[PDB]
Write a protein that binds this DNA or RNA. Structure first.
Lengths: 95, 206, 103, 108, 60, 149, 78
RNA sequence: AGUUGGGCACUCUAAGGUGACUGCCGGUGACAAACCGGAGGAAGGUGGGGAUGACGUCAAAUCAUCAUGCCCCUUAUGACCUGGGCUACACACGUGCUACAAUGGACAGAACAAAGGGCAGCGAAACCGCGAGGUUAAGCCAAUCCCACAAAUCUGUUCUCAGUUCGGAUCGCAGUCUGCAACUCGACUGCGUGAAGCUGGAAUCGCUAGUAAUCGCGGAUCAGCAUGCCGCGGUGAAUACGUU
């Protein structure tokens, strides 16, 4: 029961993490807090000009934030609660 | 080599994304689909003065939010418009599409709407010297700590083009907390193509 | 077991000072077996010589990252931190000689 | 001695054989391992038996005897029949294939 | 001479190795990225105006 | 603007001294400080073996014999290009000594550097090394143009 | 084609077979400069299109281990 | 074999906070503004670095990213296909890489990293081949598995500056991969050759600190191609008198 939540901004991931943790704990999941997981970022160095001026460039950043949540106790009530969770698209839940 | 688009700079800090979804193995497909959707809806509602459109993917489900400033026209009879829109969007995408509409209070503060109005006025043969100051005063009366307009291209004078600037108030494009709405619009006229750049300063957040 | 953190040039050192004779262990190895160029060694020993701690404490260190120079820097930083945790009486001696800057 | 002019003055047996047209570094070791000279010696400080073994081993190989003629024979083969490669070889141009607007100037 | 070459790229060639990439927005070669499938200029312009959900300005 | 200072490793495992560490810092090609350290240690060992004298005293004598007291800068008085002698500060004297030592040692030419450095140090301590010749040449240059000061 | 065997076009192979089946004929116009030269191609005069025109070439013993384009320059340098 | 039992101390990781702000003392000073030093402090005087580039000049560059008025072709300046060419080469010039050497050559043993990519994709391990590489194939949608066996460095043998065990250019032969296809026109490997070069004149360029210099690693584009561009780490200094 390993919930892999990955998002682009922590500002949204924090609310989803708090909500899932609360929903799981209320029944007895014995779930550990949101486990901070290392981020993965990819850079895209790009020429800012059209034709000339190779030296001029612009760098855009890819940032992805993900955190793990593990549930120990079966407590199928927790699974039922998890099944009915509706959150924004930035979470991309994956068990 | 001059100022960068403020919108492209404030993103990730204060301004929110105009698109939100984690794409698994289909990021390019989702991107192109949403680009096609935006182009379609823009060329369809151009007569409705639409400013922006955000989209969210909900696992084979699409949610759309439209900021119109005049939804009465976008809804029309209610079922007619929503159908003509959602049926076509589902046909293009092939999956479920859901639509939502939001009204805009004080439409004079939206960059895209003001830019489109100025482009229409210019295409309507209205004098820029008037339109610029008129829109500036309208925005200032609608509530804004700073506004600025730009008009460049063949204004009908001669084979020598120029760019005009009109503004008032504080417009600190360098301040990283300004929440400035910058929008560009094009106006294809009989003498050529004109470009309008309008960035509006509504206020900062502490 | 006086513990002290040490970092330098993308390196990390976990130093724990235990009562012994002065035997220093680096990832279950000796000083020379892992750190040639005795210049670094005497540099690592600078905090141990400024104060009277010749052979009153054994050192067990776990290092990771950086290079030999950065590893020695993190090692000496952690040694200084642990020895300060042991006896803060002479904090001025080390501060005058550095070891509390984290370059 | 070996195949002609010898160079046993002060070069080790491993590198002394390199001066011969047809022997490099690896081939020198391949020969000396069969000869059994330990590859740590100077040619002038050798016995008649070891020298004879080395000379026979070299005679068994193509060392400066037929290589300089086989190369020219192949060159003529690939020149006499057109062979744009061979045309470049004859004209004094790079043969393996390289751009001409730049370096590879070693051919005129 | 853009839409013609666009249809060319769309049509499956005799040898699959002939296939290549295009922007699909302006139809340009020369640095169309695979992940985004957009060219340099279009990619920059779209990233500026809110689109491209995850990408932001880089700095470090 | 204003001036600024700088420091380096003062101690040294063998031949503990500030100037020895400064020299070790010099002759550091491509940042390979370990190679310079090893070469200097081997050269000092060769100095102490070839002669029954401590390398410290020989090194100090060579430094003092190489220390250029007077420099000669450039002063473009119109189309004259005059050269004016200059009093060298002790730090500048030491830096010039180290520079000349390293340069003439690498210029000597031998099987290995350590031998060149040992020979150069021995000659300088005897007031006969190439660095001493450079000192004498600089002193003569300063003398020729001493009329300016 | 290195270990897959010598490479050759199908049309050129069919033409060379129709040629060698009974006897030699006039020069053959072929645009394939990539195809190799098999041992059976000896005596078959063929004209390679070097971009400008079709240049005839006669195959021989020393021309089996190479390709056709080796005997059909595409650029002129006097 | 950190694998296992046990734990979340420490490192590390990712969220919220504190901290640094001329904050305090001495001195100078118009008492202020401001400056030198000092103590506390991890950080002292915009701490180090990146984005943030005003009005305007250069009718600077781009109709070839896109659109674009005017003019022009329109059974053709529009459109389809094979091959060649875009890689030419008498000579010169910028940018970058390799050397001219013993701080090094060749060989043997040992050790420290960071960052990032991976689904028709990365591909361990095994077998085979003097080698580029081929077959089977675990694992990996990823802090797990792979890319990926880091190099400089240390420790040992040896060469003594011989156009050399430096240089490998160039060349003949024999193989490997890619892809319909490698001659014109790719890369890599083994055998043999090894050319010039012995540090470079006019003059000129970059760098005031983890900088230069030096040695490697990954990535985009990509079937295939990297001395090119971006990023990361390892070793790592000297000067700054003073504006003539």
């Amino acid at each position: 029961i390993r919930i892999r939540l990955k998002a682009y901004d922590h500002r949204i991931l924090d609310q989803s993490a708090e909500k899932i943790v609360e929903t799981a704990k209320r029944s007895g999941a014995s779930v550990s807090g949101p486990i901070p997981l290392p981020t993965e970022k990819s850079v895209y160095t790009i020429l800012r000009a059209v034709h000339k001026y190779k030296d001029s460039r612009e760098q855009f950043e890819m940032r992805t934030h993900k955190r793990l949540i593990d549930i120990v106790n079966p407590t199928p009530q927790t699974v039922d609660a998890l099944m009915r969770l509706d959150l924004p698209s930035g979470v991309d839940i994956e068990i | 080599g001059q100022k960068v688009n403020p919108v492209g700079l404030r993103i990730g800090v204060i301004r929110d994304w105009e698109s939100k979804w984690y794409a698994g193995k289909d990021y390019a497909d989702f991107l192109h689909e949403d680009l096609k959707i935006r182009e379609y809806i823009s060329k369809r509602l151009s007569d409705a003065s639409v400013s922006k459109v955000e989209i969210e993917r909900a696992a084979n489900r699409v949610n759309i939010t439209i900021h119109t400033a005049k939804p009465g026209m976008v809804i029309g009879k209610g079922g007619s418009e929503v159908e003509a829109l959602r049926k076509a969007l589902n046909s293009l995408t092939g999956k479920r599409v859901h639509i939502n509409i939001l009204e805009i209070k004080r439409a004079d503060l939206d960059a895209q709407l003001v830019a489109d109005n100025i482009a229409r006025q210019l295409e309507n043969r209205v004098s820029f010297r008037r339109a610029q100051k008129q829109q500036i005063q309208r925005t200032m009366r609608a509530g804004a700590q700073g506004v600025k307009t730009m008009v460049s291209g063949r204004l009908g004078g001669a084979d020598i083009a120029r760019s005009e600037y009109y503004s008032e108030g504080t417009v600190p494009l360098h301040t990283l907390r300004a929440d400035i709405d910058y929008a560009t619009s094009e106006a294809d006229t009989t003498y050529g193509k004109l470009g309008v750049k309008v960035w509006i300063y509504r206020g900062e957040v502490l | 077991q006086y513990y002290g953190t040490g970092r330098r040039k993308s390196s990390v050192a976990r130093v724990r000072l235990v009562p012994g004779e002065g035997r220093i262990v680096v990832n279950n190895r000796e000083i020379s077996e892992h750190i040639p160029s005795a210049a670094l060694i005497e540099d690592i020993k600078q905090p141990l010589t400024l104060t009277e701690t010749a052979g009153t404490y054994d050192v067990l260190v776990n290092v990771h990252g950086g290079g030999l120079s950065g590893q020695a820097g993190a090692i000496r930083h952690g040694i200084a931190r642990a020895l300060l945790e042991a006896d803060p009486e002479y904090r001025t001696t080390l501060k005058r000689a550095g070891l509390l800057t984290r370059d | 001695r070996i195949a002609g002019v010898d160079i046993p003055r002060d070069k080790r047996v491993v590198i002394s054989l390199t001066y011969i047209f047809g022997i490099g570094r690896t081939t020198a070791q391949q020969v000396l391992k069969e000869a059994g000279v330990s590859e740590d010696t100077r040619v002038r400080d050798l016995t008649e038996e070891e020298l004879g073994k080395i000379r026979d081993i070299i005679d068994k190989l193509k060392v400066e005897g037929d290589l300089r003629r086989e190369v020219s024979l192949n060159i003529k083969r690939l020149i006499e029949i057109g062979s744009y490669r061979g045309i470049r070889h004859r004209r004094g141009l790079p043969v393996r294939g390289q751009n001409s607007k730049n370096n590879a100037r070693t051919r005129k | 001479a853009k839409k013609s070459m666009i249809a060319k790229q769309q049509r499956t060639p005799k040898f699959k190795v002939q296939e290549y990439t295009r922007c699909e927005r302006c139809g340009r070669p020369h640095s169309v990225i695979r992940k985004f499938k957009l060219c340099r200029i279009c990619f920059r312009e779209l990233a500026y105006k809110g689109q491209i959900p995850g990408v932001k300005k880089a700095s470090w | 603007k204003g001036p600024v200072a700088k420091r380096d490793v003062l101690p040294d495992p063998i031949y503990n001294s500030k100037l020895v560490s400064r020299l070790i810092n010099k002759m550091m090609i491509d940042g390979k400080k370990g190679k310079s350290q090893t070469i200097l240690y081997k050269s000092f060992d060769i100095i102490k073996e070839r002669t029954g004298n401590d390398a410290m005293e020989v090194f100090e004598q060579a430094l003092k014999n190489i220390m250029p007291v007077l420099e000669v800068k450039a002063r473009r008085v119109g189309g004259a290009n005059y050269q004016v002698p200059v009093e060298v500060r002790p730090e500048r004297r030491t830096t010039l000594g180290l520079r000349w030592l390293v340069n003439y040692a690498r210029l000597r030419g031998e099987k290995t550097m350590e031998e060149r450095l040992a020979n150069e140090i021995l000659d300088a301590a005897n007031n006969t090394g190439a660095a001493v010749k450079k000192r004498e040449d600089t002193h003569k240059m300063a003398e020729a143009n001493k009329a300016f000061a | 084609s290195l270990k897959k065997g010598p490479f050759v076009d199908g049309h050129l192979m069919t033409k060379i077979e129709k040629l060698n089946e009974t006897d030699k004929k006039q020069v053959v116009k072929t645009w394939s400069r990539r195809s190799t030269i098999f041992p059976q191609f000896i005596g078959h005069t063929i004209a390679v299109y070097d971009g400008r025109k079709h240049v005839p070439v006669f195959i021989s013993e020393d021309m089996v281990g190479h390709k056709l384009g080796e005997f059909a320059p595409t650029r002129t340098y006097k």
